[PDB]
Amino acid sequence: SEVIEDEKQFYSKAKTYWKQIPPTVDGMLGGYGHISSIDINSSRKFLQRFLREGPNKTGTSCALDCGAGIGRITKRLLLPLFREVDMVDITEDFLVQAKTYLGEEGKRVRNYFCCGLQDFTPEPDSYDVIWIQWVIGHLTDQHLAEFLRRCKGSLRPNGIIVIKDNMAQEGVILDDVDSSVCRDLDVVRRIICSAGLSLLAEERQENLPDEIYHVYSFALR
Ligand X SMILES: Nc1ncnc2c1ncn2[C@@H]1O[C@H](CSCC[C@H](N)C(=O)O)[C@@H](O)[C@H]1O
Q: Which residues bind ligand KYF (CB under 6 A)?
A: 29-30, 32, 134-135, 137-138, 165-166, 175, 177-178, 180, 212-213, 215
Residue 66 Cβ vs ligand X, minimum distance, rounded to whole Å: 7
Distance CA 122, CA 86 (A): 10
- Please indicate if the annotation marks 67 as binding a ligand: yes
Distance CA 175, CA 172 (A): 10
| Beta-strand pair 214-220/199-204 | antiparallel
Buried residues in 82-101 as b, exposed as e (16+ CB within 10 A): beebbbbbbbebbbebbeeb
| Beta-strand pair 62-66/127-133 | parallel
**166 touches which of ligand KYF, ligand X, none (CB within 5 to 8 A by kind)?**
ligand KYF
Q: Which residues bind ligand X (CB under 6 A)?
A: 11, 14, 18, 28, 67-69, 72-73, 89-91, 94, 116-117, 133-135, 138-139
Distance CA 126, CA 54 (A): 22
Please name which of 178, 179, 201, 181 lies closest in space to residue 189, comparing C-alpha atoms: 201
Beta carbon nearer to ligand KYF, 64 or 132: 132
Residue 71 Cβ vs ligand X, minimum distance, rounded to whole Å: 7
- Please indicate if the annotation marks 171 as binding a ligand: no
Using an 8 Å Cβ cutoff, are 172 and 215 in contact? no
- Please indicate if the annotation marks 197 as binding a ligand: no
Distance CA 194, CA 127 (A): 22
Residue 179 Cβ vs ligand KYF, minimum distance, rounded to whole Å: 9
**32 touches which of ligand KYF, ligand X, none (CB within 5 to 8 A by kind)?**
ligand KYF
**18 touches which of ligand KYF, ligand X, none (CB within 5 to 8 A by kind)?**
ligand X
Distance CA 219, CA 7 (A): 28
- Please indicate if the annotation marks 16 as binding a ligand: no
* Contacting residues for 3 by C-beta, under 8 A, at least 6 apart: 141, 172, 174, 181
Beta carbon nearer to ligand KYF, 72 or 138: 138
Residue 138 Cβ vs ligand KYF, minimum distance, rounded to whole Å: 5
Distance CA 221, CA 209 (A): 30
What are φ and ψ of residue 33, in 5° steps?
A: -65, -10
Beta carbon nearer to ligand KYF, 120 or 213: 213
Beta carbon nearer to ligand X, 44 or 158: 44
- Please indicate if the annotation marks 133 as binding a ligand: yes
Q: Tell me the binding residues.
A: 67, 72, 89-91, 117-118, 133
Annotated binding site for S-adenosyl-L-methionine: 67, 72, 89-91, 117-118, 133
